[PDB]
Design a protein around this ligand. Structure first.
Ligand code: HEM
Length: 149
Protein backbone atom coordinates (compact mmCIF):
# COMPACT_ATOMS: atom_id res chain seq x y z
CA UNK A 1 0.00 0.00 0.00
CA UNK A 2 1.52 3.21 -1.22
CA UNK A 3 1.35 6.61 0.50
CA UNK A 4 -1.56 8.27 -1.36
CA UNK A 5 -3.95 5.36 -0.83
CA UNK A 6 -2.86 5.25 2.82
CA UNK A 7 -4.11 8.73 3.75
CA UNK A 8 -7.30 7.97 1.82
CA UNK A 9 -7.86 4.87 3.95
CA UNK A 10 -7.06 6.74 7.20
CA UNK A 11 -9.31 9.70 6.42
CA UNK A 12 -12.27 7.54 5.40
CA UNK A 13 -11.88 5.27 8.44
CA UNK A 14 -12.08 8.17 10.96
CA UNK A 15 -15.84 8.45 10.45
CA UNK A 16 -16.36 4.74 10.89
CA UNK A 17 -14.16 4.34 13.87
CA UNK A 18 -16.29 6.80 15.87
CA UNK A 19 -19.17 4.31 15.94
CA UNK A 20 -17.78 0.88 15.07
CA UNK A 21 -20.77 -1.27 16.04
CA UNK A 22 -23.27 0.93 14.18
CA UNK A 23 -21.08 0.65 11.12
CA UNK A 24 -20.31 -3.08 11.47
CA UNK A 25 -24.04 -3.64 11.94
CA UNK A 26 -24.48 -2.31 8.37
CA UNK A 27 -21.69 -4.60 7.09
CA UNK A 28 -23.28 -7.73 8.56
CA UNK A 29 -26.86 -6.77 7.69
CA UNK A 30 -25.67 -6.38 4.12
CA UNK A 31 -23.72 -9.63 4.30
CA UNK A 32 -26.73 -11.68 5.38
CA UNK A 33 -28.94 -9.88 2.83
CA UNK A 34 -26.52 -10.92 0.06
CA UNK A 35 -25.82 -14.43 1.32
CA UNK A 36 -28.19 -15.68 4.01
CA UNK A 37 -26.51 -19.11 3.86
CA UNK A 38 -23.74 -17.56 6.01
CA UNK A 39 -26.19 -17.00 8.86
CA UNK A 40 -25.89 -20.54 10.31
CA UNK A 41 -22.11 -20.13 10.69
CA UNK A 42 -22.64 -17.87 13.68
CA UNK A 43 -24.01 -20.05 16.47
CA UNK A 44 -24.16 -19.15 20.13
CA UNK A 45 -25.51 -21.08 23.10
CA UNK A 46 -26.30 -24.08 20.92
CA UNK A 47 -28.63 -22.09 18.70
CA UNK A 48 -28.97 -21.14 15.02
CA UNK A 49 -30.36 -17.71 14.13
CA UNK A 50 -33.58 -18.03 12.11
CA UNK A 51 -33.49 -14.59 10.44
CA UNK A 52 -30.80 -11.92 10.00
CA UNK A 53 -32.57 -9.65 12.49
CA UNK A 54 -32.15 -12.37 15.10
CA UNK A 55 -28.38 -11.99 14.86
CA UNK A 56 -28.61 -8.30 15.71
CA UNK A 57 -30.40 -9.19 18.96
CA UNK A 58 -27.50 -11.41 20.11
CA UNK A 59 -24.98 -9.76 22.40
CA UNK A 60 -22.47 -12.46 21.45
CA UNK A 61 -22.88 -11.66 17.77
CA UNK A 62 -22.66 -7.91 18.35
CA UNK A 63 -19.48 -8.57 20.32
CA UNK A 64 -18.26 -10.53 17.31
CA UNK A 65 -18.89 -7.48 15.15
CA UNK A 66 -16.77 -5.38 17.52
CA UNK A 67 -13.89 -7.85 17.13
CA UNK A 68 -14.12 -7.64 13.34
CA UNK A 69 -14.10 -3.86 13.47
CA UNK A 70 -11.14 -3.84 15.82
CA UNK A 71 -9.17 -6.04 13.37
CA UNK A 72 -10.01 -3.76 10.46
CA UNK A 73 -8.94 -0.85 12.70
CA UNK A 74 -5.59 -2.62 13.23
CA UNK A 75 -5.22 -2.97 9.46
CA UNK A 76 -5.84 0.76 9.00
CA UNK A 77 -3.31 1.51 11.74
CA UNK A 78 -0.74 -0.58 9.86
CA UNK A 79 -1.75 0.34 6.31
CA UNK A 80 1.76 1.62 5.40
CA UNK A 81 3.52 -1.57 6.51
CA UNK A 82 1.12 -4.46 7.02
CA UNK A 83 3.86 -7.07 7.42
CA UNK A 84 3.64 -5.83 11.02
CA UNK A 85 0.21 -7.50 11.17
CA UNK A 86 1.17 -10.53 9.05
CA UNK A 87 1.48 -13.02 11.85
CA UNK A 88 -1.73 -11.99 13.49
CA UNK A 89 -3.57 -12.22 10.16
CA UNK A 90 -2.23 -15.70 9.50
CA UNK A 91 -3.43 -16.67 13.00
CA UNK A 92 -6.86 -15.26 12.13
CA UNK A 93 -6.93 -17.38 8.99
CA UNK A 94 -6.07 -20.36 11.19
CA UNK A 95 -8.99 -19.48 13.46
CA UNK A 96 -11.49 -19.62 10.64
CA UNK A 97 -10.09 -23.03 9.61
CA UNK A 98 -11.44 -24.46 11.72
CA UNK A 99 -14.20 -23.31 14.00
CA UNK A 100 -15.52 -24.56 10.71
CA UNK A 101 -15.36 -22.63 7.43
CA UNK A 102 -13.39 -21.77 4.33
CA UNK A 103 -12.94 -18.23 3.04
CA UNK A 104 -14.67 -18.97 -0.27
CA UNK A 105 -17.17 -16.14 0.43
CA UNK A 106 -14.32 -13.64 0.90
CA UNK A 107 -15.50 -11.46 -1.97
CA UNK A 108 -19.00 -11.15 -0.52
CA UNK A 109 -17.63 -10.07 2.86
CA UNK A 110 -15.43 -7.66 0.95
CA UNK A 111 -18.36 -6.22 -0.98
CA UNK A 112 -20.25 -5.85 2.32
CA UNK A 113 -17.34 -3.86 3.79
CA UNK A 114 -17.26 -1.66 0.68
CA UNK A 115 -21.04 -1.28 0.85
CA UNK A 116 -20.82 -0.05 4.44
CA UNK A 117 -18.06 2.40 3.46
CA UNK A 118 -19.99 3.66 0.42
CA UNK A 119 -23.12 4.30 2.49
CA UNK A 120 -21.21 6.02 5.31
CA UNK A 121 -19.04 8.25 3.15
CA UNK A 122 -21.56 9.18 0.44
CA UNK A 123 -19.94 11.66 -1.96
CA UNK A 124 -16.59 11.21 -0.22
CA UNK A 125 -16.50 7.58 -1.38
CA UNK A 126 -14.33 8.42 -4.40
CA UNK A 127 -13.09 5.98 -7.08
CA UNK A 128 -9.65 6.39 -5.51
CA UNK A 129 -11.14 5.63 -2.07
CA UNK A 130 -12.85 2.43 -3.25
CA UNK A 131 -9.74 1.21 -5.04
CA UNK A 132 -7.62 1.80 -1.94
CA UNK A 133 -10.00 -0.17 0.26
CA UNK A 134 -10.29 -2.98 -2.27
CA UNK A 135 -6.52 -3.35 -2.24
CA UNK A 136 -6.29 -3.21 1.55
CA UNK A 137 -9.06 -5.78 1.89
CA UNK A 138 -7.31 -7.96 -0.70
CA UNK A 139 -4.01 -7.78 1.20
CA UNK A 140 -5.70 -8.78 4.47
CA UNK A 141 -7.46 -11.76 2.86
CA UNK A 142 -4.20 -12.96 1.34
CA UNK A 143 -2.47 -13.00 4.73
CA UNK A 144 -5.45 -14.85 6.22
CA UNK A 145 -5.30 -17.34 3.34
CA UNK A 146 -1.63 -18.03 4.13
CA UNK A 147 -3.00 -18.70 7.61
CA UNK A 148 -5.50 -21.23 6.60
CA UNK A 149 -3.24 -23.15 4.13
C1 HEM B 1 -14.42 -15.10 4.04
C2 HEM B 1 -15.62 -15.03 4.58
C3 HEM B 1 -15.67 -15.05 6.12
C4 HEM B 1 -16.52 -15.81 6.78
C5 HEM B 1 -17.57 -16.78 6.17
C6 HEM B 1 -16.32 -15.61 8.19
C7 HEM B 1 -17.04 -16.28 9.19
C8 HEM B 1 -16.61 -16.22 10.51
C9 HEM B 1 -17.13 -17.02 11.59
C10 HEM B 1 -18.25 -18.07 11.48
C11 HEM B 1 -16.46 -16.70 12.70
C12 HEM B 1 -16.69 -17.32 14.09
C13 HEM B 1 -17.85 -16.58 14.75
C14 HEM B 1 -18.04 -17.00 16.17
O1 HEM B 1 -18.10 -18.23 16.44
O2 HEM B 1 -18.15 -16.09 17.03
C15 HEM B 1 -15.48 -15.68 12.37
C16 HEM B 1 -14.61 -15.10 13.27
C17 HEM B 1 -13.87 -13.94 13.07
N1 HEM B 1 -13.67 -13.26 11.87
FE1 HEM B 1 -14.55 -13.85 10.11
N2 HEM B 1 -15.30 -14.66 8.31
C18 HEM B 1 -14.84 -14.27 7.04
C19 HEM B 1 -13.82 -13.34 6.74
C20 HEM B 1 -13.26 -12.45 7.69
C21 HEM B 1 -12.46 -11.27 7.42
C22 HEM B 1 -12.12 -10.79 5.98
C23 HEM B 1 -12.09 -10.69 8.59
C24 HEM B 1 -11.25 -9.41 8.87
C25 HEM B 1 -10.66 -8.64 7.95
C26 HEM B 1 -12.64 -11.49 9.67
C27 HEM B 1 -12.47 -11.22 11.03
C28 HEM B 1 -12.88 -12.11 12.02
C29 HEM B 1 -12.54 -12.01 13.42
C30 HEM B 1 -11.68 -10.91 14.09
C31 HEM B 1 -13.18 -13.19 14.10
C32 HEM B 1 -13.05 -13.52 15.60
C33 HEM B 1 -11.75 -14.32 15.70
C34 HEM B 1 -11.45 -14.80 17.10
O3 HEM B 1 -12.41 -15.07 17.87
O4 HEM B 1 -10.25 -14.92 17.45
N3 HEM B 1 -13.37 -12.57 9.10
N4 HEM B 1 -15.60 -15.38 11.01
Amino acid sequence: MERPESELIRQSWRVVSRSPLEHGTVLFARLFALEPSLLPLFQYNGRQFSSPEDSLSSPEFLDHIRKVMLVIDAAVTNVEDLSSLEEYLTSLGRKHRAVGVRLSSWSTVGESLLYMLEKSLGPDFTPATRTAWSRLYGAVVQAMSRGWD
